[PDB]
Amino acid sequence: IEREKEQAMAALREQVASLSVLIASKVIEKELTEQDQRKLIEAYIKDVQEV
Protein backbone atom coordinates (compact mmCIF):
# COMPACT_ATOMS: atom_id res chain seq x y z
CA ILE A 1 0.00 0.00 0.00
CA GLU A 2 2.84 2.35 0.88
CA ARG A 3 4.53 1.60 -2.45
CA GLU A 4 1.30 2.31 -4.27
CA LYS A 5 1.03 5.65 -2.48
CA GLU A 6 4.57 6.61 -3.44
CA GLN A 7 3.91 5.60 -7.03
CA ALA A 8 0.76 7.72 -7.09
CA MET A 9 2.69 10.71 -5.76
CA ALA A 10 5.36 10.22 -8.40
CA ALA A 11 2.72 9.97 -11.12
CA LEU A 12 1.04 13.18 -10.02
CA ARG A 13 4.40 14.93 -9.97
CA GLU A 14 5.20 13.72 -13.46
CA GLN A 15 1.87 14.98 -14.76
CA VAL A 16 2.42 18.35 -13.15
CA ALA A 17 5.90 18.59 -14.63
CA SER A 18 4.60 17.76 -18.08
CA LEU A 19 1.89 20.37 -17.82
CA SER A 20 4.36 23.00 -16.65
CA VAL A 21 6.85 22.42 -19.46
CA LEU A 22 4.33 22.86 -22.28
CA ILE A 23 3.01 26.03 -20.69
CA ALA A 24 6.55 27.33 -20.29
CA SER A 25 7.23 26.63 -23.96
CA LYS A 26 4.08 28.53 -24.92
CA VAL A 27 5.16 31.46 -22.75
CA ILE A 28 8.58 31.43 -24.41
CA GLU A 29 6.90 31.40 -27.82
CA LYS A 30 4.81 34.40 -26.80
CA GLU A 31 7.84 36.28 -25.46
CA LEU A 32 9.85 38.39 -27.91
CA THR A 33 13.09 36.77 -29.06
CA GLU A 34 14.94 39.82 -30.38
CA GLN A 35 16.52 40.38 -26.98
CA ASP A 36 16.83 36.62 -26.55
CA GLN A 37 18.68 36.03 -29.80
CA ARG A 38 21.50 38.33 -28.73
CA LYS A 39 21.60 36.64 -25.33
CA LEU A 40 21.74 33.18 -26.87
CA ILE A 41 24.72 34.22 -28.95
CA GLU A 42 26.43 35.49 -25.82
CA ALA A 43 25.61 32.23 -24.03
CA TYR A 44 27.01 30.22 -26.91
CA ILE A 45 30.21 32.23 -26.77
CA LYS A 46 30.41 31.67 -23.02
CA ASP A 47 29.85 27.95 -23.49
CA VAL A 48 32.61 27.82 -26.08
CA GLN A 49 34.95 29.63 -23.70
CA GLU A 50 34.08 27.17 -20.94
CA VAL A 51 34.69 24.21 -23.24
Binding site: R3, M9, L12, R13, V16, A43, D47, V51
Partner: protein
Amino acid sequence: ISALIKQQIENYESQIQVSDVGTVIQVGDGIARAHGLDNVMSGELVEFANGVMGMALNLEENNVGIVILGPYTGIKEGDEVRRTGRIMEVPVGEALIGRVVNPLGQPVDGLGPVETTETRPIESPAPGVMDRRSVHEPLQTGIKAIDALVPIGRGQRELIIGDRQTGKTSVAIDTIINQKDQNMISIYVAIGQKESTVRTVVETLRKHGALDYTIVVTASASQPAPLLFLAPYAGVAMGEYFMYKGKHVLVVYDDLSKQAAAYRELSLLLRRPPGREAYPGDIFYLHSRLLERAAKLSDAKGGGSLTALPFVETQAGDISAYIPTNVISITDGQIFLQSDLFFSGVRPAINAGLSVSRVGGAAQIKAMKKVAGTLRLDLAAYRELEAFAQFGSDLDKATQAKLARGARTVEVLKQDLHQPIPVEKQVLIIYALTRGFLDDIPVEDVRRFEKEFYLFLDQNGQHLLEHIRTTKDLPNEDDLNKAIEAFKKTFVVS
Protein backbone atom coordinates in the same frame (compact mmCIF):
# COMPACT_ATOMS: atom_id res chain seq x y z
CA ILE B 1 5.81 18.49 -4.34
CA SER B 2 5.93 22.28 -4.70
CA ALA B 3 8.83 22.80 -2.27
CA LEU B 4 11.48 20.62 -3.92
CA ILE B 5 10.57 22.01 -7.35
CA LYS B 6 11.22 25.57 -6.13
CA GLN B 7 14.43 24.47 -4.40
CA GLN B 8 15.78 22.77 -7.53
CA ILE B 9 14.70 25.74 -9.66
CA GLU B 10 16.68 27.96 -7.28
CA ASN B 11 19.64 25.54 -7.34
CA TYR B 12 20.12 25.00 -11.09
CA GLU B 13 22.75 26.66 -13.30
CA SER B 14 22.97 26.90 -17.08
CA GLN B 15 25.08 24.56 -19.20
CA ILE B 16 25.62 23.42 -22.79
CA GLN B 17 25.85 19.68 -23.41
CA VAL B 18 27.76 17.85 -26.13
CA SER B 19 26.01 14.98 -27.86
CA ASP B 20 28.42 12.90 -30.07
CA VAL B 21 25.77 11.29 -32.23
CA GLY B 22 25.53 8.78 -35.07
CA THR B 23 22.73 7.67 -37.38
CA VAL B 24 21.39 4.16 -37.89
CA ILE B 25 22.04 2.32 -41.16
CA GLN B 26 20.41 -1.05 -40.49
CA VAL B 27 18.19 -2.59 -37.83
CA GLY B 28 17.50 -6.29 -37.77
CA ASP B 29 17.04 -9.16 -35.31
CA GLY B 30 18.43 -7.17 -32.38
CA ILE B 31 21.63 -5.99 -34.11
CA ALA B 32 22.18 -2.58 -35.68
CA ARG B 33 24.81 -0.85 -37.79
CA ALA B 34 25.38 2.88 -37.57
CA HIS B 35 27.27 5.64 -39.36
CA GLY B 36 28.78 8.45 -37.37
CA LEU B 37 30.16 7.86 -33.86
CA ASP B 38 33.71 8.82 -34.75
CA ASN B 39 35.19 8.71 -31.24
CA VAL B 40 33.18 5.78 -29.86
CA MET B 41 35.28 3.07 -28.22
CA SER B 42 34.81 -0.68 -28.32
CA GLY B 43 32.41 -2.10 -25.77
CA GLU B 44 30.88 1.31 -25.08
CA LEU B 45 27.26 1.75 -24.06
CA VAL B 46 25.35 3.77 -26.63
CA GLU B 47 21.81 5.09 -26.25
CA PHE B 48 19.17 5.21 -28.97
CA ALA B 49 16.54 7.90 -29.44
CA ASN B 50 13.83 6.05 -27.49
CA GLY B 51 16.00 5.22 -24.46
CA VAL B 52 17.04 1.68 -25.42
CA MET B 53 20.73 1.00 -24.76
CA GLY B 54 23.21 -0.59 -27.14
CA MET B 55 26.64 -2.20 -27.03
CA ALA B 56 29.27 -1.37 -29.66
CA LEU B 57 30.93 -4.66 -30.56
CA ASN B 58 32.48 -3.98 -33.95
CA LEU B 59 34.19 -0.73 -34.87
CA GLU B 60 34.60 -0.90 -38.62
CA GLU B 61 36.03 1.71 -40.95
CA ASN B 62 32.87 3.72 -41.59
CA ASN B 63 30.18 2.09 -39.41
CA VAL B 64 29.79 0.82 -35.85
CA GLY B 65 28.22 -2.54 -35.10
CA ILE B 66 25.75 -1.97 -32.27
CA VAL B 67 24.05 -4.78 -30.35
CA ILE B 68 20.66 -3.62 -29.08
CA LEU B 69 20.12 -4.19 -25.35
CA GLY B 70 16.35 -4.44 -25.19
CA PRO B 71 13.32 -4.15 -27.48
CA TYR B 72 14.50 -3.38 -31.01
CA THR B 73 11.06 -2.81 -32.54
CA GLY B 74 11.12 0.92 -31.80
CA ILE B 75 14.48 1.49 -33.49
CA LYS B 76 14.33 2.46 -37.16
CA GLU B 77 16.76 3.37 -39.91
CA GLY B 78 17.45 7.08 -39.54
CA ASP B 79 17.30 7.16 -35.74
CA GLU B 80 19.93 8.98 -33.72
CA VAL B 81 22.43 7.00 -31.62
CA ARG B 82 24.45 8.97 -29.10
CA ARG B 83 27.34 8.01 -26.85
CA THR B 84 27.52 7.62 -23.10
CA GLY B 85 31.29 7.53 -22.56
CA ARG B 86 31.22 4.37 -20.45
CA ILE B 87 32.17 0.73 -21.06
CA MET B 88 29.28 -1.58 -20.05
CA GLU B 89 28.44 -0.28 -16.61
CA VAL B 90 25.93 -1.92 -14.32
CA PRO B 91 24.99 -0.19 -11.05
CA VAL B 92 26.56 -1.95 -8.07
CA GLY B 93 26.21 -1.37 -4.36
CA GLU B 94 24.73 -2.43 -1.06
CA ALA B 95 21.43 -0.80 -2.12
CA LEU B 96 20.89 -3.49 -4.77
CA ILE B 97 20.36 -6.19 -2.12
CA GLY B 98 16.76 -7.37 -2.01
CA ARG B 99 15.84 -6.24 -5.53
CA VAL B 100 15.04 -8.01 -8.79
CA VAL B 101 16.80 -6.34 -11.72
CA ASN B 102 17.47 -6.91 -15.41
CA PRO B 103 21.10 -7.43 -16.58
CA LEU B 104 21.47 -3.66 -17.11
CA GLY B 105 20.74 -3.11 -13.41
CA GLN B 106 17.31 -1.49 -13.88
CA PRO B 107 14.64 -2.58 -11.38
CA VAL B 108 12.02 -5.00 -12.69
CA ASP B 109 10.16 -5.87 -9.48
CA GLY B 110 8.64 -2.39 -9.38
CA LEU B 111 9.60 -1.35 -5.84
CA GLY B 112 11.03 2.00 -6.90
CA PRO B 113 14.43 3.01 -8.24
CA VAL B 114 17.69 1.40 -7.15
CA GLU B 115 19.70 4.24 -5.62
CA THR B 116 23.34 3.20 -5.96
CA THR B 117 26.51 5.27 -6.24
CA GLU B 118 29.24 3.15 -7.85
CA THR B 119 29.35 1.12 -11.06
CA ARG B 120 31.55 -1.72 -12.24
CA PRO B 121 32.29 -2.74 -15.84
CA ILE B 122 30.71 -5.91 -17.16
CA GLU B 123 33.87 -7.35 -18.72
CA SER B 124 36.69 -6.92 -16.17
CA PRO B 125 39.79 -9.13 -15.82
CA ALA B 126 39.91 -12.10 -13.50
CA PRO B 127 42.15 -12.22 -10.41
CA GLY B 128 45.70 -13.26 -11.18
CA VAL B 129 47.65 -16.34 -10.20
CA MET B 130 49.30 -14.64 -7.24
CA ASP B 131 46.08 -12.85 -6.25
CA ARG B 132 44.43 -16.14 -5.27
CA ARG B 133 44.60 -18.53 -2.32
CA SER B 134 43.58 -22.14 -1.82
CA VAL B 135 39.97 -22.88 -0.93
CA HIS B 136 39.84 -23.86 2.74
CA GLU B 137 36.53 -22.42 4.07
CA PRO B 138 33.26 -24.39 3.91
CA LEU B 139 30.26 -23.21 1.92
CA GLN B 140 27.47 -25.09 3.68
CA THR B 141 24.55 -25.83 1.36
CA GLY B 142 22.38 -27.62 3.93
CA ILE B 143 21.74 -30.46 1.52
CA LYS B 144 23.08 -33.61 3.18
CA ALA B 145 24.25 -35.36 0.02
CA ILE B 146 26.10 -32.25 -1.17
CA ASP B 147 27.66 -31.33 2.20
CA ALA B 148 28.69 -34.94 2.82
CA LEU B 149 29.60 -36.40 -0.57
CA VAL B 150 30.41 -33.51 -2.95
CA PRO B 151 31.40 -30.66 -0.60
CA ILE B 152 31.60 -27.06 -1.77
CA GLY B 153 34.15 -24.58 -0.49
CA ARG B 154 34.10 -20.81 -0.66
CA GLY B 155 35.84 -19.77 -3.87
CA GLN B 156 35.31 -22.73 -6.19
CA ARG B 157 33.03 -23.29 -9.15
CA GLU B 158 30.73 -26.27 -8.69
CA LEU B 159 28.79 -27.21 -11.81
CA ILE B 160 25.30 -28.49 -11.03
CA ILE B 161 24.41 -30.49 -14.13
CA GLY B 162 21.42 -32.62 -15.03
CA ASP B 163 18.39 -32.98 -17.25
CA ARG B 164 15.25 -30.87 -17.13
CA GLN B 165 12.93 -31.40 -14.14
CA THR B 166 15.71 -32.85 -11.99
CA GLY B 167 15.88 -30.33 -9.15
CA LYS B 168 18.72 -27.98 -10.08
CA THR B 169 16.78 -24.82 -9.21
CA SER B 170 15.61 -26.42 -5.96
CA VAL B 171 19.23 -27.13 -4.98
CA ALA B 172 20.00 -23.48 -5.80
CA ILE B 173 17.17 -22.12 -3.67
CA ASP B 174 18.04 -24.44 -0.77
CA THR B 175 21.66 -23.33 -0.76
CA ILE B 176 20.58 -19.67 -1.01
CA ILE B 177 18.14 -20.07 1.91
CA ASN B 178 20.81 -21.73 4.07
CA GLN B 179 23.10 -18.67 3.93
CA LYS B 180 20.96 -16.76 6.45
CA ASP B 181 23.24 -17.37 9.43
CA GLN B 182 26.48 -16.99 7.46
CA ASN B 183 28.05 -13.77 6.20
CA MET B 184 27.41 -14.92 2.60
CA ILE B 185 25.79 -12.65 0.01
CA SER B 186 23.91 -14.73 -2.54
CA ILE B 187 23.15 -13.82 -6.15
CA TYR B 188 20.64 -15.77 -8.24
CA VAL B 189 21.06 -15.19 -11.97
CA ALA B 190 18.08 -16.57 -13.92
CA ILE B 191 18.86 -16.95 -17.63
CA GLY B 192 16.05 -17.93 -19.97
CA GLN B 193 13.69 -19.19 -17.30
CA LYS B 194 9.95 -18.78 -17.33
CA GLU B 195 9.26 -15.51 -15.57
CA SER B 196 6.42 -17.11 -13.61
CA THR B 197 8.95 -19.55 -12.14
CA VAL B 198 11.26 -16.64 -11.33
CA ARG B 199 8.25 -14.97 -9.66
CA THR B 200 7.63 -18.03 -7.50
CA VAL B 201 11.39 -18.27 -6.79
CA VAL B 202 11.42 -14.67 -5.51
CA GLU B 203 8.36 -15.43 -3.38
CA THR B 204 9.81 -18.61 -1.89
CA LEU B 205 12.97 -16.67 -1.12
CA ARG B 206 11.06 -13.90 0.66
CA LYS B 207 9.04 -16.45 2.63
CA HIS B 208 12.27 -17.87 4.09
CA GLY B 209 13.65 -14.36 4.66
CA ALA B 210 16.26 -14.84 1.96
CA LEU B 211 15.78 -11.50 0.18
CA ASP B 212 17.51 -9.71 3.07
CA TYR B 213 20.85 -10.77 1.57
CA THR B 214 20.32 -12.09 -1.98
CA ILE B 215 20.04 -10.37 -5.35
CA VAL B 216 17.94 -11.77 -8.19
CA VAL B 217 19.12 -10.88 -11.70
CA THR B 218 16.54 -12.05 -14.23
CA ALA B 219 16.63 -12.26 -18.03
CA SER B 220 13.61 -14.28 -19.06
CA ALA B 221 12.83 -16.46 -22.07
CA SER B 222 10.97 -13.69 -23.91
CA GLN B 223 13.80 -11.17 -23.62
CA PRO B 224 16.12 -10.71 -26.62
CA ALA B 225 19.38 -12.68 -26.77
CA PRO B 226 21.63 -9.68 -25.87
CA LEU B 227 20.02 -9.45 -22.42
CA LEU B 228 20.35 -13.23 -22.13
CA PHE B 229 24.04 -12.93 -23.04
CA LEU B 230 24.85 -10.32 -20.36
CA ALA B 231 22.98 -11.79 -17.38
CA PRO B 232 25.89 -13.81 -15.88
CA TYR B 233 28.38 -11.03 -16.51
CA ALA B 234 26.06 -8.68 -14.64
CA GLY B 235 25.91 -11.34 -11.92
CA VAL B 236 29.67 -11.35 -11.38
CA ALA B 237 29.79 -7.58 -11.83
CA MET B 238 27.34 -7.22 -8.93
CA GLY B 239 29.23 -9.85 -6.93
CA GLU B 240 32.71 -8.41 -7.30
CA TYR B 241 31.66 -5.19 -5.58
CA PHE B 242 31.41 -7.24 -2.40
CA MET B 243 34.21 -9.66 -3.33
CA TYR B 244 36.83 -6.92 -3.55
CA LYS B 245 35.52 -5.33 -0.34
CA GLY B 246 36.34 -8.53 1.55
CA LYS B 247 32.88 -10.09 1.72
CA HIS B 248 31.97 -13.59 0.55
CA VAL B 249 29.57 -13.93 -2.38
CA LEU B 250 27.63 -16.89 -3.77
CA VAL B 251 26.53 -16.57 -7.41
CA VAL B 252 24.15 -19.09 -9.00
CA TYR B 253 23.64 -19.24 -12.78
CA ASP B 254 20.36 -20.90 -13.66
CA ASP B 255 20.88 -22.63 -17.04
CA LEU B 256 24.12 -21.42 -18.61
CA SER B 257 23.12 -23.66 -21.53
CA LYS B 258 20.45 -21.00 -22.16
CA GLN B 259 23.27 -18.47 -22.20
CA ALA B 260 25.19 -20.54 -24.75
CA ALA B 261 22.09 -20.89 -26.94
CA ALA B 262 21.56 -17.13 -26.84
CA TYR B 263 25.18 -16.36 -27.70
CA ARG B 264 24.86 -18.84 -30.56
CA GLU B 265 21.82 -16.83 -31.68
CA LEU B 266 23.61 -13.49 -31.28
CA SER B 267 26.63 -14.70 -33.26
CA LEU B 268 24.73 -16.45 -36.07
CA LEU B 269 22.82 -13.21 -36.54
CA LEU B 270 26.25 -11.53 -36.84
CA ARG B 271 26.98 -14.24 -39.47
CA ARG B 272 29.94 -15.75 -37.66
CA PRO B 273 30.86 -19.25 -38.88
CA PRO B 274 29.79 -21.85 -36.32
CA GLY B 275 31.40 -25.07 -35.11
CA ARG B 276 30.19 -28.21 -33.35
CA GLU B 277 26.42 -28.12 -32.67
CA ALA B 278 26.44 -24.77 -34.54
CA TYR B 279 28.08 -23.04 -31.58
CA PRO B 280 30.63 -20.28 -32.26
CA GLY B 281 34.32 -20.80 -31.69
CA ASP B 282 34.40 -18.60 -28.59
CA ILE B 283 31.59 -20.45 -26.81
CA PHE B 284 34.31 -21.80 -24.50
CA TYR B 285 35.70 -18.31 -23.95
CA LEU B 286 32.18 -17.10 -23.12
CA HIS B 287 31.98 -19.37 -20.07
CA SER B 288 35.71 -19.28 -19.33
CA ARG B 289 36.08 -15.55 -18.86
CA LEU B 290 32.91 -15.75 -16.74
CA LEU B 291 33.66 -18.57 -14.30
CA GLU B 292 37.38 -17.87 -13.98
CA ARG B 293 36.38 -14.42 -12.67
CA ALA B 294 35.05 -16.23 -9.55
CA ALA B 295 37.92 -16.85 -7.17
CA LYS B 296 39.21 -17.09 -3.60
CA LEU B 297 41.38 -14.04 -3.05
CA SER B 298 44.53 -13.93 -0.96
CA ASP B 299 45.08 -11.97 2.23
CA ALA B 300 46.74 -9.12 0.32
CA LYS B 301 43.66 -8.66 -1.87
CA GLY B 302 41.23 -8.84 1.04
CA GLY B 303 40.46 -12.50 1.60
CA GLY B 304 37.00 -12.35 0.05
CA SER B 305 35.69 -15.02 -2.28
CA LEU B 306 33.18 -15.58 -5.07
CA THR B 307 31.83 -19.13 -5.13
CA ALA B 308 29.91 -19.91 -8.31
CA LEU B 309 27.24 -22.55 -8.97
CA PRO B 310 26.65 -22.70 -12.73
CA PHE B 311 23.98 -24.94 -14.24
CA VAL B 312 24.07 -26.96 -17.45
CA GLU B 313 20.95 -28.69 -18.77
CA THR B 314 21.68 -31.99 -20.50
CA GLN B 315 19.61 -33.81 -23.10
CA ALA B 316 18.87 -37.44 -22.08
CA GLY B 317 21.66 -37.40 -19.49
CA ASP B 318 24.47 -37.09 -22.05
CA ILE B 319 27.37 -35.63 -20.06
CA SER B 320 29.66 -36.06 -23.10
CA ALA B 321 28.01 -33.28 -25.10
CA TYR B 322 29.70 -30.05 -26.17
CA ILE B 323 28.47 -27.39 -23.70
CA PRO B 324 28.56 -29.85 -20.71
CA THR B 325 32.17 -30.79 -21.45
CA ASN B 326 33.03 -27.13 -21.99
CA VAL B 327 31.72 -26.27 -18.54
CA ILE B 328 33.17 -29.39 -16.82
CA SER B 329 36.65 -28.38 -18.02
CA ILE B 330 36.21 -24.94 -16.41
CA THR B 331 34.57 -25.79 -13.09
CA ASP B 332 36.08 -27.50 -10.05
CA GLY B 333 33.72 -30.47 -10.00
CA GLN B 334 30.16 -31.38 -10.81
CA ILE B 335 26.99 -32.46 -9.04
CA PHE B 336 25.29 -34.75 -11.54
CA LEU B 337 21.55 -35.16 -11.00
CA GLN B 338 19.94 -38.38 -12.24
CA SER B 339 16.50 -38.48 -13.77
CA ASP B 340 16.19 -42.17 -12.91
CA LEU B 341 16.78 -41.39 -9.24
CA PHE B 342 14.54 -38.32 -9.45
CA PHE B 343 11.61 -40.31 -10.81
CA SER B 344 12.27 -43.23 -8.46
CA GLY B 345 11.80 -40.81 -5.55
CA VAL B 346 15.42 -40.13 -4.53
CA ARG B 347 15.37 -36.34 -4.13
CA PRO B 348 18.05 -34.73 -4.31
CA ALA B 349 18.87 -37.16 -7.10
CA ILE B 350 22.65 -36.84 -6.85
CA ASN B 351 24.52 -39.48 -8.81
CA ALA B 352 27.38 -39.98 -6.37
CA GLY B 353 29.52 -41.74 -8.98
CA LEU B 354 29.49 -39.08 -11.68
CA SER B 355 29.60 -36.22 -9.15
CA VAL B 356 32.95 -35.12 -7.71
CA SER B 357 34.42 -32.13 -5.88
CA ARG B 358 38.05 -31.17 -6.31
CA VAL B 359 38.86 -28.53 -3.69
CA GLY B 360 36.16 -30.12 -1.56
CA GLY B 361 37.59 -32.47 0.99
CA ALA B 362 39.83 -29.58 1.91
CA ALA B 363 36.56 -27.74 2.56
CA GLN B 364 34.83 -30.07 5.03
CA ILE B 365 34.75 -29.16 8.68
CA LYS B 366 37.10 -31.90 10.14
CA ALA B 367 34.04 -33.83 11.38
CA MET B 368 32.21 -34.45 8.10
CA LYS B 369 35.41 -36.03 6.69
CA LYS B 370 35.58 -38.77 9.33
CA VAL B 371 31.81 -39.18 9.30
CA ALA B 372 31.24 -39.15 5.51
CA GLY B 373 34.06 -41.20 3.92
CA THR B 374 32.32 -44.39 5.04
CA LEU B 375 29.01 -42.91 3.81
CA ARG B 376 30.47 -42.39 0.33
CA LEU B 377 31.88 -45.92 0.12
CA ASP B 378 28.60 -47.42 1.43
CA LEU B 379 26.56 -45.51 -1.16
CA ALA B 380 28.90 -46.50 -4.01
CA ALA B 381 28.71 -50.14 -2.91
CA TYR B 382 24.91 -49.98 -2.68
CA ARG B 383 24.32 -48.42 -6.07
CA GLU B 384 26.79 -50.78 -7.74
CA LEU B 385 25.33 -53.89 -6.08
CA GLU B 386 21.63 -53.06 -6.51
CA ALA B 387 21.70 -53.08 -10.32
CA PHE B 388 23.39 -56.49 -10.50
CA ALA B 389 22.07 -58.35 -7.42
CA GLN B 390 18.36 -57.61 -7.94
CA PHE B 391 17.46 -61.22 -8.76
CA GLY B 392 18.69 -64.32 -6.97
CA SER B 393 20.18 -64.93 -3.54
CA ASP B 394 23.75 -64.27 -2.41
CA LEU B 395 26.08 -64.50 0.57
CA ASP B 396 25.20 -62.97 3.93
CA LYS B 397 27.68 -60.07 3.90
CA ALA B 398 26.50 -58.75 0.52
CA THR B 399 22.90 -59.43 1.58
CA GLN B 400 23.10 -57.47 4.83
CA ALA B 401 26.18 -55.27 5.37
CA LYS B 402 26.03 -53.77 1.87
CA LEU B 403 22.36 -53.64 0.86
CA ALA B 404 20.61 -53.21 4.22
CA ARG B 405 22.97 -50.37 5.12
CA GLY B 406 22.89 -48.80 1.66
CA ALA B 407 19.10 -48.56 1.64
CA ARG B 408 19.52 -46.67 4.92
CA THR B 409 22.12 -44.41 3.27
CA VAL B 410 19.59 -43.63 0.53
CA GLU B 411 16.86 -42.96 3.09
CA VAL B 412 19.18 -40.69 5.11
CA LEU B 413 20.37 -38.67 2.11
CA LYS B 414 16.81 -37.77 1.03
CA GLN B 415 15.51 -34.35 2.04
CA ASP B 416 12.26 -32.47 1.98
CA LEU B 417 12.04 -29.26 -0.01
CA HIS B 418 13.10 -25.82 1.30
CA GLN B 419 14.37 -27.33 4.58
CA PRO B 420 18.16 -27.06 4.83
CA ILE B 421 19.85 -28.81 7.73
CA PRO B 422 22.65 -27.28 9.86
CA VAL B 423 25.93 -29.10 9.48
CA GLU B 424 26.17 -30.38 13.07
CA LYS B 425 22.87 -32.25 12.70
CA GLN B 426 24.11 -33.65 9.38
CA VAL B 427 27.34 -34.79 11.07
CA LEU B 428 25.38 -36.46 13.87
CA ILE B 429 22.86 -38.20 11.61
CA ILE B 430 25.55 -39.53 9.26
CA TYR B 431 27.50 -40.60 12.37
CA ALA B 432 24.44 -42.56 13.51
CA LEU B 433 24.10 -43.97 9.99
CA THR B 434 27.71 -45.04 9.40
CA ARG B 435 28.54 -46.26 12.92
CA GLY B 436 25.85 -48.95 12.62
CA PHE B 437 22.96 -47.48 14.59
CA LEU B 438 20.33 -47.57 11.82
CA ASP B 439 20.68 -51.30 11.18
CA ASP B 440 17.71 -52.09 13.46
CA ILE B 441 15.45 -49.16 12.52
CA PRO B 442 13.60 -50.37 9.38
CA VAL B 443 14.05 -48.72 5.99
CA GLU B 444 10.56 -47.17 5.93
CA ASP B 445 11.14 -45.19 9.15
CA VAL B 446 14.66 -43.73 8.80
CA ARG B 447 13.35 -40.30 7.78
CA ARG B 448 10.97 -40.15 10.75
CA PHE B 449 13.90 -41.28 12.92
CA GLU B 450 15.92 -38.34 11.58
CA LYS B 451 13.07 -35.84 12.03
CA GLU B 452 12.57 -36.91 15.65
CA PHE B 453 16.33 -37.11 16.28
CA TYR B 454 16.79 -33.45 15.36
CA LEU B 455 14.11 -32.47 17.89
CA PHE B 456 15.89 -34.72 20.40
CA LEU B 457 19.19 -32.94 19.71
CA ASP B 458 17.61 -29.50 20.08
CA GLN B 459 16.51 -30.32 23.66
CA ASN B 460 18.87 -32.86 25.24
CA GLY B 461 22.03 -33.10 23.15
CA GLN B 462 22.70 -29.36 22.98
CA HIS B 463 26.27 -29.70 24.26
CA LEU B 464 27.17 -31.96 21.32
CA LEU B 465 25.78 -29.40 18.87
CA GLU B 466 27.68 -26.55 20.52
CA HIS B 467 30.86 -28.66 20.56
CA ILE B 468 30.66 -29.27 16.82
CA ARG B 469 29.66 -25.62 16.31
CA THR B 470 32.76 -24.31 18.13
CA THR B 471 35.48 -26.98 17.96
CA LYS B 472 34.37 -28.31 14.49
CA ASP B 473 35.60 -31.75 15.50
CA LEU B 474 33.42 -34.65 16.61
CA PRO B 475 32.75 -34.89 20.35
CA ASN B 476 33.90 -37.81 22.49
CA GLU B 477 32.58 -40.93 20.78
CA ASP B 478 31.35 -42.58 23.99
CA ASP B 479 29.56 -39.34 24.96
CA LEU B 480 27.81 -39.40 21.57
CA ASN B 481 27.04 -43.13 21.59
CA LYS B 482 25.31 -42.52 24.94
CA ALA B 483 23.04 -39.89 23.37
CA ILE B 484 22.22 -41.94 20.27
CA GLU B 485 21.54 -45.15 22.22
CA ALA B 486 19.46 -43.08 24.66
CA PHE B 487 17.37 -41.75 21.78
CA LYS B 488 16.93 -45.26 20.34
CA LYS B 489 15.11 -46.35 23.51
CA THR B 490 12.72 -43.42 23.01
CA PHE B 491 12.12 -44.03 19.30
CA VAL B 492 9.12 -46.15 18.32
CA VAL B 493 9.83 -48.57 15.51
CA SER B 494 6.27 -49.00 14.19
